[PDB]
C-alpha cells in the first residue's frame, strides 16, 4: 500500500513562505530540507574516553600559566549520531534575515516539526583490478535498516551543535551529515594556578580523578529511548513541537543613563549653525543629584532613574571539581574602547559548510568576532572611574581611582577586572541573534533557581525543548559471528536519508515614526566592502560564502 | 497498491486526434511522448560563470569592427535541467502541418498538461578485462531518486529552449535529453564602437564590470520551488494549464497601398486579349491627394486610408549596460529585392534533432532563412524614395532623396538604413509560425508597458505561461564523504525517464469563396525540388530530415 | 507630452505592388503653411458633388 | 545627403510613446462618413480618409 | 514585496560616512532649526523582466 | 537647505533608476545590409559620423 | 537589456578557476537564429530576441 520500495516516502521542500495575516502580524514558515550521509560507527560500544593535555612543553598544562589551555575532561562517547538544525543559517536564505531585519520589528518562534524520508543504505565491496588498483562496488542493501530514535522526555544530555559548528549545512543543495552524539561525563579535575614568572620550582598540580558514584551518570539510547528500525520505503516524523518562549526584539537602544529624562534648559539657542548652546549656572541649575558634598547639579551627577548596562568581571577563570573555566559576559557594546571581553564580543570558528569561503585552502577555520548593535548598556573601562566621598571635584590622585591604577601591585591588574556593578537597577538589553551561524533555541538549566537569560542562543524554552534526533546504522553483521568475542566483523555499510523540518515564526511589521530615514540592512558594489553583493554570489568554480549578517538595524526610543 | 516498482506508471501516447465539433470548429489534441535520457551534473554547485571574448585575433572584440562578434555576459550555471517542449515540430506529423495550413483559417492554444512516467535510474560499474579494456556493467538503483520541479508562479527566469535548438526531439521514435538549465546574471559591459579602416593606434574599450547590488539576482531551484522526489514507481502530473491568448490567423495578406479602396475607373475596355486599358487623363480624374503642388491625381498620389507595412532601420547595433545589440525587425515580405534584413528575415541553425539530414556530415549546423509568407507589408528599399515639398515631378537630383544616396559621406550607407515610417497609421501583419523549429508561446515582458507583438513566438501568454518543468539527478554519494570538504567523490548514475504532454487547440475550417483555385501546400515528385516526397522519407540507413514546410497558404482580402 | 509630431515629407514606400505615398496624419499646416507636412487632403469633385 | 533641396525633416519621425494628435476632420460635403476596419491582426491607430 | 532571491537585496539607507548623500545629518534639524530634504532614491529592489 | 543664501534655486537632476531600457549613444551603430563583418569606414554608420 | 534575454548560450566547460573564463561552440558552429543571413554564424549581438 502505501509503504514500498520503489516508492518515495517525502517530499523536498526548502522555502520560507511569508503569511501576513493582519495588524502587522506576519506568519513565517521556514521549510527546510537536506540529503544527510550517516556512516557506520568506528565502534559499537558505548565508550568512556578521557582527555587530558598534561604535556610539559607547548599548549601542555604543565606549562606555568597555560591554564586556560586546559581541555581536560571525560566524555561517553556513543555509536549514535545526532540530527541537530538549531542554528539560524539552516533556515533562512541571506535575503530572508534581511527582510525580517529590516522591516519586522519583533519575532518570535511558533512550531517546529521534523521528518526522514528516502532512507537508502548501500554496501561496498572490492573488486580486483589490474595495477592491483581494487575498484569499489557500491550495491543496495535493500533489507538494511536504520535506527532512528527521539528523545522527547529529554531524557539524556542536551547537546547543542550549533556551538561545535556541527549543525546541519546551510546550504540546500550540498548533501550534509549528522554529528555523532556524546555528553560529559563526570571527572574530579584540579588544575594549579600560576604564571610564566613563576618560581623554576613551582610544581603545578595537574590530577584527574577516578568516577565518582555521587555523580556518575551512564545513559544508553537503547535503554532509554523508544528506537524506530527505518527501510527504504520507511519514513520517520517527531510531530509537531510547540515552542513556549519569549519574543525577541529586532530593534536595539541608543540611550545611556546621560540621555534618560527630560534634558537641561538651554537658556538660548545656538546664533549660528555652528554655535553650541549654554546652559544655567550648575550651580543656580535646577535638578536633583545623589552626591552631597557639592552644591551644583551636572548632567554626570544628575540622578537617573536606573543603570543602562554594567560592568563586568574581566576573564574571571572560576574553578570548581570540573577544572577552570571562563565566567560567560552578557554580550554588550565594545564602545568606542572596542573594549570586547569588557562587554563579552562573541569569536565563533566555523566551517566551509558553516559559511567560510569555500575557496579559503588550509584547515585554519573561519573566524569571526560578534560586537553587539546595541549602542546602550556598553561599557567603556578606559573612562570609567570611582571616586572618594565626600565627592571633592576636582579630585586629587588619592580622591580617584582611574583604571590604570595596579591593582595588588599588578601592573596590567585594573579594579575594572574585579568589578562588578550588577544591581538592582541594572537594565540591559538581551543577547542579539547571529545569523547564520547563532543557535536559535535552549534548554533551561534544571537548577531550582535559574539564569535571567542565556548567552548562547536567543530563544530558551520555558518548559522542555524540542527533542534532539538520534540515527545510526545497525552492525552488519557477516557470516563468522563469535557472540563471546570481542571482536565484531561487519560488512562496510553506509547510509543516505532526506531529512525536512517546517519551524514557524510569528513577526510583526514594525512602525515608521520617525522624520529622519531610518538604517537598514543593504549590499552595495563597493570594493572590499564587508557588504560587496559579490560576496552571497557563487563563484565561477561553484564556491559559496556566507559572512554574517547585522541584525537590530532600527533604533528604539527605550525610555 | 498504485505504487510499485515493478507496474509501469504512465503510457506512451503520440497521436494528433482531429474532433470536428460544428459551425467548422475542430478541437486538435496534440498527444506527445517521448524518452529522455539524464546524466549526473557535472557540478553539483551553483557557478556564476562570465564568458569573455577579448582575443586580438579573429572573432575577438579587440579587433577593430569585429563588435557584432561579442559573445560576453554572465550566466548563474544551475545543476538543474530544463525539459522543454515549445516548438511546432514536438506536437506535430508534416502531414499534421500540412492539413491544418491547407484546411484551416485560424489556430489558437487551449490547454496544455504534462506527465513524467517510468523513471529508471542506473548505475555505472567498471569491471576489469583482458587487453585492459575495462567493461561498463550497468545495474539498477532501485532506491535512487530523481528530482523534479515546476515553476508554475514562473518566478524563475524564463528561457525558451526553442531559440537555442535545445528543445525535445521532433522526431518520436528517437531517445531525447533536457536541456542544462542556466540564466543571466548582470554584469557591466561597455565595447568600443570602430571600423575596419579605424587608425592603427585607435584603443578599443572591451571591459566587464563586477556585479551590481541595484541588479543582482540569484535564485536557486531549491529555495524557490517545491521538489518532487521521484523513484522508479513513482510518477510527475504538472495538472492542466489553460492558455489565455489571440487566436493565429493562418491566411497571408497581398493588398499594399496601391491595392486599396475603389479602383480608377477605364476609359474604354481592352480591346483585344493582349491590350492595355486607358484612365482619364490625370488631370481631368477625379480623386484626392495629400500633395497639393500638383493638379493631378494618380494612383501613386492617391490618398489611402492607412500604412500597410512600414520601414525599419537596418542593423540599429544599440548598446545598454549590457553591451551592443542587433534591434529586433518585424519580420515581413522581403519583396522582389529580397531585402531580408530590411524585412526581418529569420535564419535559424538547428541539428539533427531538430531536421538537420542526419546524412549530413560534419558538425557545421542545418542553416535556413525564413522569409515571411505574406506579400502585403514587405518593403523594397531599393525602390523607396522621398522628394522635396512642394513636390515637383519630376524632380531633379536635389529634389528626391534616392537609396543610392550617401548619408554622412558613407558610401554604403542610406536614408534607408536610418529611416523609420512606423506612425499611427502603420498596420502590419503578425509573425507567421515556423514548423518545424519555431516556438509556439512566449512569456510577456513584466514592463508596465509592453511590445505589441513578440518577434520569436505566434503566441504571448497574456497572464502568467505555463510553468518550466526542471529534472535532475540528486548526488549518489560513496562510503567517503567530507561534509567540511568541497570534493564530493560521488557513484557515476545516469537515469532514463518517459515523457508525455497533451497541447490541445482550437481551429476553425477555411471558408472557399473564390472561383479561381486557391494555392495549398503540397509534395511533389520533381527532381531536386524542395517538396519531393522523398525529403520526408525515411532514407535506407533510416536516415530523417525535416525541411521547413510553408504556411498561411491561402491569401484573405485586406480591406 | 508631446501635442502632435513630425511626420516623414513624400515617403514614397515601394512594394511588389510598386510605388505609394505614405499617408499622413491631417494636422495644422500652422503659419507656414506647410501643407504635406501635415497632411493636407486635397480633393477633385464634379458637378454632382459640388463643382 | 548633399541634396540641396533635401533636408532632416522629410526624413525626421517624432512618433513615439508621448505623441497625442486629434483625429481627422470630417469634410463636408465631399467626405466619406463609415470605412471598414483591415483585417490585419494588428490595426492602424485610424483611418486617414473617414472620421 | 516577495523576498525569493538568495543575494541580499539592494535597499535604501542611510549612513554616517562624511559628505555622503546619505548622511543622516541631511534629514536632521540644524543648531538653527534649518532644515533641507534632498530627493531619495526609488524602486531599490530590482524585478527580473522575461 | 535653509542655510543655502543667495536667490539661486537649488537644481538636482534625477536619473532613472532603471538599469535596462537606457541608450548609450557613444556605443550604438547602424551597419549596412548586406551585413560585413568586420566593416570598413563606408559601411558603418557610428556616432561621430557628422551629419 | 536584449543582451539578458531568454536562454544564455551553453559553455563547452565550466570555469578552471575562479579567476578563469568559459569559452561557448564556435560561432559558425553554435545553434540559434538571427535575421541577418549574410553571416553564417550566431552571436550573443546577433541572436534574434523577442
Ligand atoms: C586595523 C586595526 O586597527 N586593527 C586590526 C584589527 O581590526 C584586526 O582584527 C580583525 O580585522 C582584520 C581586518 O583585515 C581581519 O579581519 C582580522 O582577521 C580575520 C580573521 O579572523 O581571520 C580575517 C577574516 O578574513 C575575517 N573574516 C572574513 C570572512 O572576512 C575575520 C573577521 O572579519 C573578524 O574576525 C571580525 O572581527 O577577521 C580580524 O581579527 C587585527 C588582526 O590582527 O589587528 C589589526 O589588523
Ligand atoms: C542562386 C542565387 O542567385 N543566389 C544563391 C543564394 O540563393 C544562396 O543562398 C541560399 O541558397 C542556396 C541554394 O543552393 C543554398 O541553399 C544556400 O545555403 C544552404 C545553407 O544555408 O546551408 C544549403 C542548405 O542545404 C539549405 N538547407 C536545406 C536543408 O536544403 C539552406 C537553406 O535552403 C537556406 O538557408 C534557405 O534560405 O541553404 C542558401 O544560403 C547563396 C549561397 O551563398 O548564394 C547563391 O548561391
Ligand atoms: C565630478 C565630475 O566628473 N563631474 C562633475 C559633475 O558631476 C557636476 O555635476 C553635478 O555634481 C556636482 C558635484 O559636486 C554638483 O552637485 C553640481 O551642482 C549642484 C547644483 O546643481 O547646484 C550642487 C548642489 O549642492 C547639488 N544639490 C545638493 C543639495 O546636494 C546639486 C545636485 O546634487 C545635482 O544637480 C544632481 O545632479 O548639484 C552637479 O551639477 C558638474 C558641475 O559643473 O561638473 C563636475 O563638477
Chains 1, 2 share one sequence.
Not at 377 to 397: E, H, K, L, M, W
Not at 525 to 554: E, F, Q
Request: net charge negative; aromatic share 10%; proline share 8%.
Amino acid at each position: 500500500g502505501g509503504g514500498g520500495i520503489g516508492v518515495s516516502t517525502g517530499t523536498y521542500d526548502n522555502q520560507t513562505t511569508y503569511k501576513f495575516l493582519g495588524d502587522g502580524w506576519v506568519e513565517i514558515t521556514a521549510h527546510a530540507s537536506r540529503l544527510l550521509h550517516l556512516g557506520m560507527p568506528p565502534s559499537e560500544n558505548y565508550c568512556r574516553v578521557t582527555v587530558h593535555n598534561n604535556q610539559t612543553t607547548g599548549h601542555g598544562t604543565k606549562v606555568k600559566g597555560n591554564m586556560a589551555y586546559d581541555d581536560t575532561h571525560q566524555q561517553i562517547w556513543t555509536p549514535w549520531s545526532l540530527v541537530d538544525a538549531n542554528a539560524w543559517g539552516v533556515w533562512f536564505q541571506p535575503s530572508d534575515w534581511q527582510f525580517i531585519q529590516n522591516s519586522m520589528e519583533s519575532l518570535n518562534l511558533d512550531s517546529l516539526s521534523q521528518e526522514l524520508f528516502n532512507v537508502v543504505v548501500k554496501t561496498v565491496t572490492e573488486q580486483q583490478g589490474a595495477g592491483q588498483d581494487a575498484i569499489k562496488v557500491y550495491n543496495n542493501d535493500l533489507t538494511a535498516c536504520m535506527m532512528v530514535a527521539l528523545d522527547s522526555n529529554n531524557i539524556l544530555p542536551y547537546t547543542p551543535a550549533a556551538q561545535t559548528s556541527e549543525t546541519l549545512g546551510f546550504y540546500p543543495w550540498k548533501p550534509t551529515a549528522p554529528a555523532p552524539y556524546r555528553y560529559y561525563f563526570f571527572m574530579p579535575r584540579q588544575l594549579s594556578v600560576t604564571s610564566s614568572n613563576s618560581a623554576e620550582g613551582t610544581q603545578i598540580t595537574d590530577t584527574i580523578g577516578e568516577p565518582q558514584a555521587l555523580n556518575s551518570q551512564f545513559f544508553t539510547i537503547e535503554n532509554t529511548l523508544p528506537i524506530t528500525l527505518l527501510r527504504t520505503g520507511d519514513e520517520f516524523t517527531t510531530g509537531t513541537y510547540i515552542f513556549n518562549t519569549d519574543p525577541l526584539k529586532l530593534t536595539h537602544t541608543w540611550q545611556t543613563n546621560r540621555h534618560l529624562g527630560m534634558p537641561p534648559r538651554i537658556t538660548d539657542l545656538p546664533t549660528s549653525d555652528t554655535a553650541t548652546a549654554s546652559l544655567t549656572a550648575n550651580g543656580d541649575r535646577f535638578g536633583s543629584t545623589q552626591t552631597q558634598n557639592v552644591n551644583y547639579v551636572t548632567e554626570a551627577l544628575r540622578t537617573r532613574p536606573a543603570q543602562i548596562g554594567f560592568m563586568q568581571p574581566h576573564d574571571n577563570f572560576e574553578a570548581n571539581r570540573g577544572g577552570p573555566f571562563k565566567v560567560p559576559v552578557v554580550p554588550l557594546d565594545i564602545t568606542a574602547g572596542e573594549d570586547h571581553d569588557a562587554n563579552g564580543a562573541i569569536r565563533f570558528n566555523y566551517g566551509k559548510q558553516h559559511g567560510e569561503d569555500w575557496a579559503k585552502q588550509g584547515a585554519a577555520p573561519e573566524r569571526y568576532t560578534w560586537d553587539a548593535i546595541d549602542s546602550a548598556a556598553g561599557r567603556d573601562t578606559a573612562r570609567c572611574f570611582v571616586q572618594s566621598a565626600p565627592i571633592s571635584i576636582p579630585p586629587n590622585q588619592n580622591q580617584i581611582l582611574q583604571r590604570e591604577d595596579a591593582i595588588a601591585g599588578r601592573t596590567n591588574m585594573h579594579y575594572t577586572n574585579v568589578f562588578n556593578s550588577y544591581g538592582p537597577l541594572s537594565a540591559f538589553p538581551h543577547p542579539d541573534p547571529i545569523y547564520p551561524n547563532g543557535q536559535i533555541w535552549d534548554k533551561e538549566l534544571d537548577l531550582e533557581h535559574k539564569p535571567r537569560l542565556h548567552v548562547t542562543a536567543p530563544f530558551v524554552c520555558k518548559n522542555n525543548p524540542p527533542g534532539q534526533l538520534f540515527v545510526r546504522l545497525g552492525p552488519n553483521l557477516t557470516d563468522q559471528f563469535d557472540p563471546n568475542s570481542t571482536t565484531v566483523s561487519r560488512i562496510v555499510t553506509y547510509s543516505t536519508f532526506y531529512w525536512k523540518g517546517i519551524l514557524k515564526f510569528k513577526a510583526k511589521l514594525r512602525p515608521n515614526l520617525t522624520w529622519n530615514p531610518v538604517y537598514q540592512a543593504t549590499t552595495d558594489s563597493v570594493a572590499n566592502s564587508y557588504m560587496n553583493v559579490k560576496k552571497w554570489l557563487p563563484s565561477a568554480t561553484g564556491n559559496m560564502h556566507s559572512d554574517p549578517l547585522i541584525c537590530r538595524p532600527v533604533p528604539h526610543m527605550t525610555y
